[PDB]
Design brief:
469 residues, alpha/beta, Chitobiase, domain 2, TIM Barrel, 8-stranded parallel sheet, 5-stranded mixed sheet, binds zinc ion, hydrolase, Catalyze, acetamidodeoxyhexohydrolase
Length: 469
């Protein structure tokens, strides 16, 4: 019979027999009984009543009302009356954009934010720095702009790529996100993924290479900042001071992914520093590096996060890590619990939205296909009980942009899988089903076309063309 098409699925929908042809908001009340992230939305033939426990729940209730208005706009016969009582399963529901790989203009970020807010995402993570570019301006380090923000080409295409946000643009983004219920999380990836920083400031590295250029290809860089160099710590203190001014979330993602330690092992400065500190290997050195960085953050009231790299011993109890490596989700849940770490689920089997969504679409010679149906199969807890998985804070989907050069390409791969991620982060398992989700997503094609002039239809051949290979 007649249903709503709200994504994410609300925790409770009680449908009634009457029909509503108006969604005029008749009441909008803050009530003490509901939690601050919760709302109750009642649809009657005379209009709608919204109750919420706080500003956060109110934002979510208005987001549901927006989807119901989009449904009603396409249903002249009216929509069912009913009561929706709703609160998210997980408090962290995030997407990550990758302007380091391909710069995202301010106007395009706005559209990306409006779309994620429509699905009740509440975290926007900015991957600001990598091998292919550096997008955060830092006073006192002008070569980040003149060198690190520019590259000669991408994958042999001969086409230079550059870009850097202004401080005013980033403060605009923060306010734009806050008005839509979204906290912004900057990432300064360290100690690796740093070829762009090396191109600008080779003196920060164990083996300075003045001829180094910003990377124009994918693949792994072995260049790690040298923890023995005072300039490194002065630089990151300056970076973190800018983040304190710009990003009121106070959370700084430090990255830490894909940082092989070969060059630390060989570095003549790091070798003797390890001898002085009685460090037996470079994992102990990595632990000390993160601890020193966390101490710098703590001076500003900031807190770190990391990509989980499978060695829980390098993090400090109470810190948050992101599980991402293929095949490691269950082990990561267990090891982070034992180590006293909090966990965000970003498993690349379900959440890496750079991967093609239909078999036969560009995989660049290595990417597996993650279909919409596969994505929807994600339970962030992997069926584990609360005593084993209560340290999981939520779900997070990166849209890595090595191969996504503009917003058109970004949205093509981000959606509709981001809709499934939204439901995995928000909806209790007891209201989730592929059949129901698929039904609603079909209706959402018209909703998103109407509201955003954007088409979420996916076929193998309708991905925008690429210039490479
Ligand atoms: Zn070194």
């Amino acid at each position: 019979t007649a249903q709503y098409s709200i994504i994410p699925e609300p925790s409770r929908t009680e449908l009634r027999q009457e029909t509503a042809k108006t969604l005029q908001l008749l009441s909008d009340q803050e009530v003490p009984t509901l939690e601050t992230d919760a709302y109750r939305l009642t649809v009657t033939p005379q209009g709608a009543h919204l109750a919420s426990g706080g500003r956060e729940g109110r934002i979510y209730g208005l987001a549901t009302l927006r989807q119901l208005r989009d449904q009603l706009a396409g249903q002249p016969e009216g929509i069912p009356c009913g009561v929706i009582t709703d609160k998210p399963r997980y408090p962290w529901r995030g997407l990550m954009v990758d302007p380091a790989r391909h710069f995202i203009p301010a106007a395009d970020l706005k559209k990306f934010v409006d779309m994620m807010a429509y699905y009740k995402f509440n975290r926007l993570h900015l991957h600001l720095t990598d091998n292919q570019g550096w997008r955060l301006p830092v006073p006192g380090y002008p070569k980040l702009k003149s060198v690190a923000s520019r590259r000669e080409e991408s994958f042999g295409d001969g086409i230079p790529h550059e870009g850097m946000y202004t401080k005013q643009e980033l403060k605009e983004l923060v306010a734009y996100c806050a008005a839509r219920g979204i906290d912004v999380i900057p990432e300064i990836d360290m100690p690796g993924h740093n070829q762009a920083l090396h191109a600008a400031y080779p003196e920060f590295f164990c083996f300075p290479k003045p001829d180094m250029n910003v990377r124009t290809t994918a693949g792994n860089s072995k260049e790690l900042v040298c923890p023995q160099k005072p300039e490194v710590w002065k630089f990151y203190a300056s970076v973190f001071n800018e983040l304190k001014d710009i990003f009121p979330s106070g959370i700084v993602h430090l990255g830490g992914d894909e940082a092989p330690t070969e060059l630390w092992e060989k570095c003549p400065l790091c070798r003797e520093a390890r001898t002085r500190a009685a460090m037996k290997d470079e994992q102990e050195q990595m632990k000390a590096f993160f601890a020193k960085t966390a101490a710098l953050l703590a001076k500003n009231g900031q807190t770190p996060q990391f990509w989980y790299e499978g060695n829980a011993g390098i993090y400090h109890p109470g810190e948050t890590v992101y599980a991402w490596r293929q095949g490691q989700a269950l082990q990561s849940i267990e090891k982070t619990k034992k180590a006293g770490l909090n966990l965000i689920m970003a498993s690349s089997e379900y959440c890496y939205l750079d991967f093609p969504q239909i078999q036969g679409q560009r995989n660049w010679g290595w990417m597996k296909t993650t279909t919409l149906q596969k994505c929807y199969d994600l339970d962030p807890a992997f069926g584990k009980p609360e005593k084993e998985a209560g340290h999981i804070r939520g779900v997070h989907a990166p849209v890595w942009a090595e191969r996504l050069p503009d917003l058109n390409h970004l949205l093509y791969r981000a959606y509709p899988r981001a809709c499934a991620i939204a439901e995995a982060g928000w909806s209790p398992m007891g209201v989730r089903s592929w059949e129901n989700f698929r039904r609603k997503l079909a209706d959402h094609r018209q909703f998103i076309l109407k509201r955003f002039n954007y088409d979420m239809e996916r076929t193998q051949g309708n991905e925008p063309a690429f210039r490479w290979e």
